[PDB]
Design an enzyme around this catalytic site. Structure first.
Site, short mmCIF file in Angstrom:
data_model
loop_
_atom_site.label_atom_id
_atom_site.label_comp_id
_atom_site.label_asym_id
_atom_site.label_seq_id
_atom_site.Cartn_x
_atom_site.Cartn_y
_atom_site.Cartn_z
N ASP A 1 0.90 -1.14 0.00
CA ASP A 1 0.00 0.00 0.00
C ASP A 1 0.95 1.20 0.00
OD1 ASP A 1 -2.21 1.75 0.12
OD2 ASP A 1 -3.23 0.22 1.59
N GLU B 1 -9.99 7.23 5.38
CA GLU B 1 -8.97 6.68 6.22
C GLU B 1 -8.94 7.23 7.65
OE1 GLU B 1 -5.34 5.66 4.06
OE2 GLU B 1 -6.32 6.56 2.23
#
Ligand SMILES: *[C@@H]1O[C@H](CO)[C@@H](O[C@@H]2O[C@H](CO)[C@@H](O[C@@H]3O[C@H](CO[C@H]4O[C@H](CO)[C@@H](O[C@H]5O[C@H](CO)[C@@H](O)[C@H](O)[C@H]5NC(C)=O)[C@H](O)[C@@H]4O)[C@@H](O)[C@H](O)[C@@H]3O)[C@H](O)[C@H]2NC(C)=O)[C@H](O[C@@H]2O[C@@H](C)[C@@H](O)[C@@H](O)[C@@H]2O)[C@H]1NC(C)=O
Ligand SMILES: *[C@@H]1O[C@H](CO)[C@@H](O)[C@H](O)[C@H]1NC(C)=O
Length: 602
Positions: A285, A491
């Site tokens: 990621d 997030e």
């Protein structure tokens, strides 16, 4: 002489083997390097033999850029790469998570949780088909989707990206994959990658393992659960993805019992690769490896060693590719990491590339530009938005006349609320900006526009974002629709422990409802403290983060279709109740998973 890898008529394993055999070390590590368009240059790409590029959220050519501007940017980079000694085309990735969302004018579909409420995996497959077309309209061949986390605590900033807290539902939604990649052959072997060709994109089953299981739903944190829980709750969907031919698998920032997923060879190589026999590529990621260390990037040499030995194939750097390449080059030169590791990595990346047909079609098709925001996709988003709604209450007492569906012909009505006419709010995170944004950020219809588009011409429509109680009582309104909710978040920005909606939200609902019968439309990414809102409203609908096409919402309020969605999550009585998912012992929800009132179309 004859170059087998350039021959489009050969088997993909033969071409991979052929190419691999001609690659120098720089070329191999270059393939395993993914960098952000923002640090990319025709030279950087050419000299570094760079293998992939990505747009991070909000990383775009210009605001309001058209589809050919995107194609032009992608092609530009492609040309540098095609100009290397081997001319190995690069793959361009992007978070097309609820449509081709970074792109102005792209159709924004309902976020995942709302999709879970539909219990319709075919519609999800159709969105994936639409999405692939819209991504290819901008010249991109890879979408970092689907997020198949199984959110187990809605305080997690990313709970909206999880279809349900029930993996059975998430398993059902992996139909997004053949939607995006196209269906696998009858000959098909699980674990093998697949993309039907140019009007399709490489998909990505994301946040390999346990991202939705973190403690207190703290993003990127730790998942404390035994191996039976992991595999029984968080693993299931990954296997369906393998039978569905998912091209790539992205690794989660989170930890499992203290171990980082980016440094976990048992789960990445032994399980995902050896056991499930995944044959696509495993990508990190954003700064995923920097993060194995605390402080992050405190020992980047260690990061590289740890993540590459663990099994990751391609590294989403995404900025300091220099440092990444230097270091990895060093570890191989010193034998710290073996060439077999490298070759395996490059083997997986070429297979995906060759398979999807990148060597045969490495540039954009100008003809696909009109796919972006195509009206038929928009009609589909509209369908999915409507279907994702969950009517939570439709009348104050069992003996009231049900408020919904509202009449379209009324002398005068009020549309009120911070979310009644706010496209960015309606769409939520992962939209134009990384964190989403407020206001008219792209093409679409707000709950206000949709209301005006729906009512009888004789019906006067009054808008008031935040009306006082006397304003409503003296307005001679027949009923009101009040839209309130969470603000866009992505997030960690979303990690929220209190889960109550910002004000004015409750006060406007109470204001409006005190004066006139009202239908409250709650725009949220998760379960939020709702008993107060429920207390004031005649009817209340959970619209989740419905997307750009607001008419899907009024398609139900007005009876054009009846409500069908059902909670894809447990609605909690309070946050000290959490976590609390179906099957628990202290199961004491305000609304159990699967809950949802219905109505019939007029
Ligand atoms: C439940 O816990 C939440 C913790 O995440 C908390 O919400 C977070 O609160 C912090 C402040 O403590 C806030 O951070 C600040 O952001 C300031 C800007 O706030 C704006 O930016 C975010 C990002 O764009 C926009 O949502 C909007 O806010 C107001 C009020 O409704 C509205 O009128 C605006 O028009 C709207 N503006 C926009 C562009 O959308 C954010 O909430 C505000 O715009 C910044 O300048 C400060 O330096 C600081 O960093 C977080 O943004 C916030 N997170 C989210 C996702 O909203 C909850 O706090 C409660 O709500 C907040 C909106 C505040 O009003 C705060 O006083 C409230 O307490 C918390 N709830 C409770 C009851 O504790
Ligand atoms: C999780 O969060 C706490 C901060 O809340 C931090 O100090 C801890 O190390 C984190 N754990 C992991 C695995 O990230």
């Amino acid at each position: 002489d004859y170059v087998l890898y350039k021959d489009a008529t050969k088997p993909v394993e033969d071409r991979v083997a052929d190419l691999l055999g001609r690659m120098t070390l720089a070329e191999k590590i270059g393939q395993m390097t993914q960098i952000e368009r923002l640090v990319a240059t025709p030279d950087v790409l050419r000299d570094n033999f760079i293998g992939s590029l990505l747009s991070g959220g909000g990383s775009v050519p210009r605001k309001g850029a058209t589809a050919k501007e995107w194609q032009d940017m992608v092609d530009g980079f492609q040309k540098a790469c095609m100009s290397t000694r081997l001319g190995i085309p690069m793959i361009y990735g992007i978070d097309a998570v609820h449509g081709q969302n970074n792109v102005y004018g792209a159709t924004i579909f309902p976020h995942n949780v709302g999709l879970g409420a539909t219990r319709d995996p075919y519609l999800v497959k159709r969105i994936g088909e639409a999405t692939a077309l819209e991504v290819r309209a901008t010249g991109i061949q890879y979408a970092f989707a689907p997020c198949i986390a199984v959110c187990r605590d809605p305080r997690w900033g990313r709970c909206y990206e999880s279809y349900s807290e029930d993996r059975r539902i998430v398993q059902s939604m992996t139909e997004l994959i053949p939607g995006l990649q196209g269906d696998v052959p009858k000959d098909f072997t699980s674990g093998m990658p697949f993309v039907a060709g140019k009007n399709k994109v490489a998909a990505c089953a994301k946040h390999f393992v346990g991202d939705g299981g973190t403690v207190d739903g703290i993003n990127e944190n730790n998942t404390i659960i035994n191996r039976e829980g992991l595999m029984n709750i968080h693993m299931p969907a990954y296997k369906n993805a393998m039978d569905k031919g998912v091209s790539t698998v992205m690794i989660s920032y989170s930890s499992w019992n203290g171990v980082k997923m980016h440094a976990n060879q048992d789960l990445v190589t032994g399980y995902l690769k050896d056991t499930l026999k995944f044959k696509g590529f495993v990508i990190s990621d954003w700064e995923g490896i920097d993060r194995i260390t605390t402080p992050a990037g405190s020992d980047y040499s260690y990061s590289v060693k740890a993540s590459i030995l663990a099994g990751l194939d391609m590294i989403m750097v995404p900025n300091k590719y220099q440092q990444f390449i230097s270091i990895l080059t060093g570890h191989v030169n010193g034998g710290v990491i073996p060439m077999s590791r490298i070759d395996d990595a490059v083997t997986r990346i070429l297979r995906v590339k060759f398979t999807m047909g990148l060597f045969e079609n490495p540039y954009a098709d100008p003809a696909m530009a009109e796919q972006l925001g195509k009206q038929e996709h928009r009609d589909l988003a509209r369908e999915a938005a409507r279907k994702s709604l969950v009517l939570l209450k439709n009348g104050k007492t069992s003996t009231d006349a049900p408020l919904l569906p509202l009449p379209k012909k009324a002398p005068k009505i009020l549309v009120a609320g911070s979310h009644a006419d706010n496209l960015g709010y309606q769409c939520g995170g992962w939209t134009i900006e990384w964190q989403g944004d407020t206001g008219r950020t792209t093409v679409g219809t707000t709950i206000l526009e949709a209301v005006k588009a729906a009512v009888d011409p004789s019906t006067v429509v009054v808008f008031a974002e935040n009306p006082d109680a006397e304003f409503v009582k003296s307005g001679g309104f027949s009923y009101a629709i009040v839209a309130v909710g969470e603000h866009p978040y992505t997030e960690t920005k979303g990690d929220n422990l209190n889960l109550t909606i910002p004000e004015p939200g409750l006060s406007t609902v109470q204001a409006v409802c005190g004066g006139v019968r009202c239908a409250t439309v709650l725009i949220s990414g998760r379960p939020v403290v709702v008993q107060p809102l429920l207390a004031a409203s005649d009817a209340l609908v959970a619209a989740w983060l419905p997307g750009s096409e607001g008419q899907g919402v009024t398609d139900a309020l007005f009876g054009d279709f009846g409500f069908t969605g059902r909670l894809p999550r447990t609605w909690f009585k309070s946050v000290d109740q959490l976590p609390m998912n179906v099957g628990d012992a202290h199961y004491d929800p305000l609304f159990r998973l699967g809950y949802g009132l219905t109505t019939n179309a007029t």
